[PDB]
A paper describes a structure:
[name] acts as a substrate recognition subunit of the CRL4DDB1 E3 ligase complex and facilitates the ubiquitination and proteasomal degradation of its target proteins. The damage-specific DNA binding protein 1 ([name]) acts as an integral component of the Cullin4A/B (CUL4A/B)–RING E3 ubiquitin ligase (CRL4) complex.
The protein complex was purified from Expi293F cells by coexpressing the human [name] WD40 domain with full-length cyclin D1, CDK4EE, and [name]. The resulting electron density map allowed unambiguous tracing of the AMBRA1WD40 domain, the BPA and BPC domains of [name], and the extreme C terminus of cyclin D1, allowing us to build a reliable atomic model. The density for most of the cyclin D1–CDK4EE subcomplex was not visible, probably due to its flexibility, and only the last 11 residues of cyclin D1 assume well-defined conformation in the electron density map. The interaction between [name] and [name] is mediated by the helix-loop-helix motif located at the N terminus of [name] (residues E6 to K41). From the overall structure, the extreme C-terminal region of cyclin D1 (residues C285 to I295) binds in a turn-like conformation to the top surface of AMBRA1WD40 and covers the central pore of the β-propeller. The interaction interface between cyclin D1 C terminus and AMBRA1WD40 spans across blades I and II and extends to the center of the β-propeller. The pThr286 (phosphorylated Thr286) phosphate group interacts with the side chains of R96 and H75 and forms hydrogen bond with the backbone NH of T97 in AMBRA1WD40.
Residue numbers in the entry:
A (entry chain A): 1 to 366, 373 to 392, 710 to 744, 749 to 771, 782 to 1013, 1023 to 1112, 1122 to 1140
B (entry chain E): 285 to 295
C (entry chain B): 4 to 204, 856 to 910, 918 to 962, 973 to 1001, 1008 to 1041
The structure:
């Protein structure tokens, strides 16, 4: 009995994987980028990057490979969906048209194994004979490739070692061999096996096991002329190959860990390394011929090259240009020359792409959007007008935001990391202001302490007027600005909670309030409390904050003295809280959404209905009066209802689930507004970076759009042979149900792209409807976003 | 008549 | 240390970190909670009037609960609501085990004291197979990947398949009074676990071996000296021995006065005794927490059960202490105290008078 509509306004921008090779032809370089569910293909020219194709995929992309079977000219792709799909694609240039052909497709999924806490790992044999898939713990998967496995059969093999970190295929062997790093309560070691595709067993293993450091997390396979493997860990770069052992311990690798790697030369003499601070590194190998024989390495050396953004996918294109992907900031394009500029760097920049990054909080003000973005050293506020994006850089990690209409200023809570011998690292925006005030409240070596402060941002040219640093080991989590009681002045209210790094959950907090009237902000009330103030929302003139699994409603006397009125100790760690006008509110974070009511005749909370079948939540929003919205961490959406019935013991106390969906993203925040015939408009942001919009159509356009959605799937051609029904249906670890309710959105919006001859294949029998008479309903819906 | 307690039924 | 504070865990989750076991730590925290709270028992209304309940088992994902009764039928209810949805009916005498199929869908087996296996299909469908000497069926266990079913009749194992009308393998146990009582598998379907009678000249004892079933090799039970794990123990039904969800732990009730012990099943310390405790001669059931950090022991003769938390790693009588005390919300006994599969949803115990109740945690 619920009908909603979801449409994407901005495609995902964060990059989670990139590969390079020869795909379009045999005489051109191709760079392939897949953000979350997209697939961008570029051609690397001398001037820069030229785009040629961008296709969408049903399901998120989690692993990409690029191999070359014997007896061919152009290579073939390999993409596996996080929903455990599989496909092998090619590239065809038919005159002036470019389409992607599918050669093999199938499903590989086991309903027994648990998902390991490392991610899906995919490795392909350099000789193009095997494909490895480490999906579940202790289970290996082998896919033979003999131009006969058109359905991609597989057979699982047992692994005794449970904890596995990284797996790679070695070079220069007469049979497929693998090596990996496993962990047990003795210390991580490295062991190697030998996969047999004719007997389905691990036969011998080419060399004995060793002992490595306590933080080794990466394995690199060197090319043929050297042979062996490279393991890089925290302050330990090791080498093992048969009977050979070389190790180094540079001191310029201590402050940060290594994440990514990418080969540079086709011989293995040059490597690139990254870290979660920038610090583009560079590995070197030394060659030495031994009379009449092969080459043996002499020593290894690592040198600095400069700084970049936080990297998650690194590659070397050609001639000295390097593409750097990112997920917490922007993706750049750098050039490595042979010289030394001022301050001693070898890296310059010439391009900078756009990425909304992890949208933590979002607000609507006049339509216009002001949102937080990024984390650590990269990320700041963004202004999405109406889709021009304005960046106002600040070197901190924003957490929340709010707005007042009486002072023309925002409010942002940020964090800043500084180690002690406490003097920071780089000039940030939380310190370089024209006013500061340390919160004085007498009420209560080599480490990395975090400090939080509240800064006020004027909105005329986005300056930074005032800053207010909190106490030691004190985090800020909730902020709101509103009126209170009977007092003609708007205040600033911030909730906080002290965190100790040792034990459990916090047990203390504060409800400090502020007032930035003339030139600065003062403090009028603290009201120390026992618990964490995860969230707080302004009621009809009373405070309402969930205090660490306890919902309180604070009043406000004449003088500044906050005093509680009610108490509802029933929930377990209720973080998120929203209300709509009346005495309606919600809960979350250890169950599904429940509903409470406030009775003004006698101050007390009255439980109305709580929904069972636990679901971990990420954001809750109320739609009109009864249609509730939630967002599970399993990348799904659902809508609840009050379930009108009459039993007085099993009715009016159960919330019926009348809608399920699979967005595929991680919804982080909801809001009310519209940038630009439905009723209502709700926006949301995602971790990967995406703006959507949920509307509602009353009772009739649903039976016309759902009827078109089924018939539109038999004329469109999916890139990997997916029917769009398996992808968009509530896929959890255990349960799986078809999606009823939400319409497909972008699938309907794509109807205005197919050519005219294919138009008279859909809507052939429902007057009787025509192409011209129905090419305007899509136009009416293509103005909401 | 099968006993109602699990500790006195034969099997 | 992979972080210990929820504030820094949610912060990492919000920006897509996924480092280490964040979800595991959150589940451990939510199970450490629900310890200072209170529990209320909600009853279940059954169609007919059963005078006793024996065994409980759950759905293959998480969302259904089965039940047996002396009334010669099997009832299936719903966990979320608490109402029966199906009433099987069809057996001649009381069943002894259910063994919900773990993999595909809604497939439920059933034993009896006359030698019948039904293999119901819920929404229509039922088969049958009979013994040759009107012997009872101790237990059954399915196989996750392959198409195979094991039946614990008198001292044979039949390895039946529900495609044809007859089994295809028979394995003996030498002498005739060494019967089989437990054939439960492992969560990943890589190992077996049998429990046969130890021969003697007093009360009967059992032996639990740990056979290997990796390459579908028929185990040889005729040898009583290979792959011993526990030696003496006491078994009543399928609820007298439980394996943790991860499969890294195994409980037992070895005697001599009965003492409780749990043995690790890891390949490197397979056989260590670890935790231990002494109980009286009235413990009937034992169940483990979904995360393997809490153990509930059902009592029979008011008090219903006791819950302990494993604390000290490798010995000492101080290991695990009382933290809980569940009470009947009023000559009544208890035959099952199994934990719900969800990490911290509640309890569910049977009643000697024929009552099924579900307990849930509530605050002050």
């Amino acid at each position: 009995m619920s009908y909603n509509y979801v449409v994407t306004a901005q495609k995902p921008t964060a990059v989670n994987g990139c590969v390079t090779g020869h795909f379009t032809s045999a005489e051109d370089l191709n760079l392939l980028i897949a953000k979350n569910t997209r697939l961008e293909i570029y051609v690397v020219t001398a001037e820069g990057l030229r785009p040629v194709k961008e296709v969408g995929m049903y399901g998120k992309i989690a692993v990409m490979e690029l191999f070359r079977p014997k007896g061919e000219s152009k290579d073939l792709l390999f993409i596996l969906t996080a929903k455990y799909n599989a496909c092998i694609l090619e590239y065809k240039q038919s005159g002036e048209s470019i389409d992607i052909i599918t050669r093999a497709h199938g499903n590989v999924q086991d309903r027994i194994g648990r998902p390991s806490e490392t991610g899906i790992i995919g490795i392909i044999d350099p000789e193009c004979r095997m494909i490895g898939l480490r999906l579940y713990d202790g289970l290996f998967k082998v896919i033979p490739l003999d131009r006969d496995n058109k359905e991609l059969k597989a057979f699982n093999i047992r692994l005794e070692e449970l904890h596995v970190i990284d797996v790679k295929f070695l070079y220069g062997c007469q049979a497929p061999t693998i090596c990996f790093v496993y962990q047990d309560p003795q210390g991580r070691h490295v062991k190697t096996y030998e996969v047999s595709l004719r007997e389905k067993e691990f036969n011998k293993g080419p060399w004995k096991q060793e002992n490595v450091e306590a933080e080794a997390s990466m394995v690199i396979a060197v090319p043929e002329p050297f042979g062996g493997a490279i393991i890089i860990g925290q302050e330990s770069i090791t080498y093992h190959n048969g009977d050979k052992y070389l190790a180094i311990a540079p001191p310029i690798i201590k402050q940060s860990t290594i994440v990514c790697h990418n080969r540079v030369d086709p011989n293995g003499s040059r490597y690139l390394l990254g870290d979660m601070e920038g610090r583009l590194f560079m590995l070197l190998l030394e060659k030495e011929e031994q009379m009449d024989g092969t080459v043996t390495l002499k020593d290894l050396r690592v040198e600095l090259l400069g700084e970049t953004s936080i990297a998650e996918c690194l590659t070397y294109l050609d001639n000295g240009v390097v593409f750097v992907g990112s997920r917490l900031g922007d993706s750049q394009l750098v050039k490595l020359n042979v010289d030394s500029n001022e301050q001693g760097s070898y890296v310059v920049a010439m391009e900078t792409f756009t990425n909304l990054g992890p949208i933590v909080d979002m607000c609507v003000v006049d339509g216009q959007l002001v949102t937080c973005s990024g984390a650590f050293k990269e990320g700041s506020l963004r202004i999405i007008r109406n889709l021009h994006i304005r960046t106002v850089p600040l070197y901190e990690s924003p957490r929340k935001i709010c707005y007042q209409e009486v002072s023309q200023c925002f409010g942002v809570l940020s964090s800043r990391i500084e180690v002690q011998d406490t003097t920071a690292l780089r000039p940030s925006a939380s310190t370089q202001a024209l006013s500061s005030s340390v919160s004085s409240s007498k009420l209560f070596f080599g480490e990395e302490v975090e400090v939080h402060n509240l800064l006020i941002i004027d909105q005329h040219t986005f300056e930074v007027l005032h800053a207010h640093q909190f106490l030691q080991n004190e985090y800020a989590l909730s902020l709101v600005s509103c009126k209170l009681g009977k007092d003609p002045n708007t205040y600033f209210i911030v909730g906080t909670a002290m965190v100790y790094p040792e034990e459990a959950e916090p047990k203390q907090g504060r409800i400090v309030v502020f007032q930035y009237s003339d030139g600065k902000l003062q403090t009028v009330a603290e009201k120390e409390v026992k618990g964490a103030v995860y969230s707080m929302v302004e009621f009809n003139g009373k405070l309402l904050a969930s205090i660490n699994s306890t919902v309180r409603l604070y009043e406000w006397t004449t003088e500044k003295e906050l005093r509680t009125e009610c108490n509802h100790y029933n929930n377990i760690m209720a973080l998120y809280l929203k209300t709509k006008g009346d005495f309606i509110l919600v809960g979350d974070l250890m169950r599904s959404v429940l509903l409470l009511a406030y009775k003004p005749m006698e101050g007390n909370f009255e439980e109305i209905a709580r929904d069972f079948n636990p679901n971990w939540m990420s954001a809750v929003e109320i739609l009109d009066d009864d249609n509730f919205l939630g967002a599970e961490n399993a990348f799904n959406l659902f809508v609840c209802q009050k379930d009108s019935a009459a039993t007085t013991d099993e009715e009016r106390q159960h919330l019926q689930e009348v809608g399920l969906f699979h967005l595929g993203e991680f919804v982080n925040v909801f809001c009310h507004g519209s940038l630009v015939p439905t009723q209502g408009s709700v926006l949301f942001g995602t971790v990967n970076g995406m703006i959507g919009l949920v509307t509602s159509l009353s009772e009739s356009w649903y039976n016309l759009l759902l009827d078109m959605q089924n018939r539109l799937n038999k004329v469109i051609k999916s890139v990997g042979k997916i029917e769009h029904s398996f992808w968009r249906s509530f896929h959890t670890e255990r349960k799986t149900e078809p999606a009823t309710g939400f319409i497909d959105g972008d699938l309907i919006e794509s109807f205005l792209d197919i050519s005219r001859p294919k138009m008279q294949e859909v809507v052939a029998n429902l007057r009787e409807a025509t192409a011209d008479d129905l090419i305007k309903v899509v136009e009416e819906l293509t103005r909401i976003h | 008549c099968t006993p109602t307690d699990v500790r006195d039924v034969d099997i | 240390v992979p972080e210990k504070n929820a504030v820094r865990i949610l912060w990492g989750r919000e920006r897509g970190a996924r480092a280490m076991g964040a979800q595991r730590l959150l589940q451990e925290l939510v199970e450490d909670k629900t310890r200072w709270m209170k529990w209320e028992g909600k009853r279940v209304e059954l169609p007919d009037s059963p005078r006793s309940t024996f065994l409980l088992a759950f759905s293959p994902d998480r969302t259904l609960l089965a039940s047996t009764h002396v009334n010669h039928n099997i009832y299936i209810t719903e966990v979320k609501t608490g109402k029966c949805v199906h009433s099987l009916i069809g057996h001649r005498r009381t069943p002894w085990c259910v063994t919900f199929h773990p993999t595909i869908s809604g497939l439920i087996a059933s034993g009896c004291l006359d030698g019948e296996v039904r293999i119901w299909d819920l929404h229509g469908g039922s088969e049958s197979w009979f013994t040759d000497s009107n012997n009872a069926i101790a237990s059954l266990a399915f196989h996750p990947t392959a198409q195979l079913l094991l039946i614990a009749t008198a001292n044979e194992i039949h390895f039946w398949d529900w495609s044809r009308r007859e089994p295809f393998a028979v394995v003996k146990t030498a002498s005739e009074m060494e019967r089989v009582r437990l054939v439960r598998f492992d969560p990943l379907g890589h190992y077996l676990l049998t429990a046969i009678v130890n021969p003697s000249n007093a009360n009967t004892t059992y032996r639990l071996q740990w056979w290997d079933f990796t390459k579908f090799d028929l185990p040889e039970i005729s040898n009583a000296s290979v792959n011993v794990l526990v030696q003496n123990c006491k078994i009543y039904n399928d609820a007298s021995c439980d394996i943790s969800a991860d499969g890294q732990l195994l409980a037992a009730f070895i005697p001599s006065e009965g003492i409780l012990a749990v043995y690790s099943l890891a390949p490197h310390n397979l056989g260590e005794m670890l935790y231990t405790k002494r109980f009286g001669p009235n413990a009937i059931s034992v169940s483990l927490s979904p995360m393997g950090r809490y153990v509930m022991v059902g009592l029979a003769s008011h008090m219903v059960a006791q819950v302990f938390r494993l604390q000290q790693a490798h010995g000492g009588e101080t290991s695990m202490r009382r933290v809980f005390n569940v009470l009947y919300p009023m000559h009544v006994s208890i035959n099952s105290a199994r934990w719900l599969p969800e990490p911290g949803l509640g309890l569910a115990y049977g009643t000697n008078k024929g009552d099924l109740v579900i307990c849930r945690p509530e605050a002050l």
